[PDB]
Amino acid sequence: TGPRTCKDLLDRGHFLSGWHTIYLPDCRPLTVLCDMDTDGGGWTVFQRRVDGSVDFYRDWATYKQGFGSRLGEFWLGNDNIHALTAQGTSELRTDLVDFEDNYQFAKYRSFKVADEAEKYNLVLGAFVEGSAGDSLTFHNNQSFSTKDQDNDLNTGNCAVMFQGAWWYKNCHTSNLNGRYLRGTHGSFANGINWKSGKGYNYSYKVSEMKVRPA
Template sequence: MSRMAMFLRNHQRGHQLLLLCPEKTWRSHDVAMKANMGSCPSVINCLISLVSATWCLTFYCSTVLGARNCKELLHQGVVMSGWYTIYPDGMAPLQVLCDMDTDGGGWIVFQRRYDGSVDFYLGWDSYRRGFGSRLTEFWLGNDNLSHLTSTGTWDLRVDLKDFNNTAYYAKYSAFRIAPASDNYRLTIGAFLGGNAGDSLSYNNGMAFSTKDRDNDQWSSNCATNWPGAWWFNDCFIADLNGVYRLQQNSNPIGVLWATASTSSINYSFKISEMKIRPE
């Protein structure tokens, strides 16, 4: 195969311009195409034109690399839920779990709990950075949440399942997390409905608290008395980062959302997901 000089330039968000030019010549267009495909692994479409004057193949590669969030991925034709890399404005590339199935899809999942395999009774720095993994339960990280929600307007959706696999949800407008300088303070807008009821408005405007950073409105530390981390007020009627229970439980220490129509306001849920999507 002839040696080629390769020039890769950003054409615009989500597109790349790739020029492959032989130092002398090439055997066939097929050789050049194979060389290009190794350099554009996320190609959706490539429009190919032969620039005969310079003997270059020009590839306009439409990729998903420029998507800023899961909703943009959905609009680009990505319809399967799973882990993807997004490119939010002003942030490094970020791997996120995209829920493309629930309520029209396009959701970034930032909290997931389903089996108690990950300890959520952690400190400030762990919640700041995020913890868990794509194979386990996880928290995406308060820094990431703050950066993501700093521009635009975002909806929040909470999805829950009890130990009978009955599903509940709650939805809010205008979700935003403040930066670390304001202790990742929670702001939400209107409760948009859902059979889980509204257990979060009580925490609206509250700073985030952990076992080693007490920012709540109580004289003691909510995060140590009800082990977890949350936007505690004095203290809460929801705490989805509380202690995970392996079976149905009505202990007030648990994965709680008190307004859901379960057998007890202290019912600890089996599955919890929190997710955001641009409005």
């Protein structure tokens, strides 16, 4: 019955990025990171990597509730991301920065995750544009997986083989919750990787995933 999105806050004159309280579909308050600069601002950031201070190789219960720090890296929580994206349409933007401070991005028409009972299934709309290329449409219609809850399409455990948590199939083309392996790495596809961007052997300095009413 007040601000429901970061877009609402932007329209009310909140021009600086930072943490604000919004009110979810059910009226539950949630303190979220608003990106008010990028691409018109008004984005609610649900994932952020910047320096490798936080361990992202976490189990189901931890990804469900969210983890990390307001002062740095975090995953907002799958329950929260479902609430955020349940009804209406949120467009997704992915922002990626390499160690030479070059920026890439990918933008999708719509994005949402189902509730826990449906394994926080990815529901993704068309790739609109992005200098990072499209490395997420591959994962469309897939259950989320973590090390202790394998819902993927591999005989082995993708979350373990690539040290992350994602909507793994057999196995991935993106892996943003992968290990903070600074820049080029010999090890295959176990960093913060975006196949169509810098490839399976380059772990980004910065990663942000964010949503805005479409």
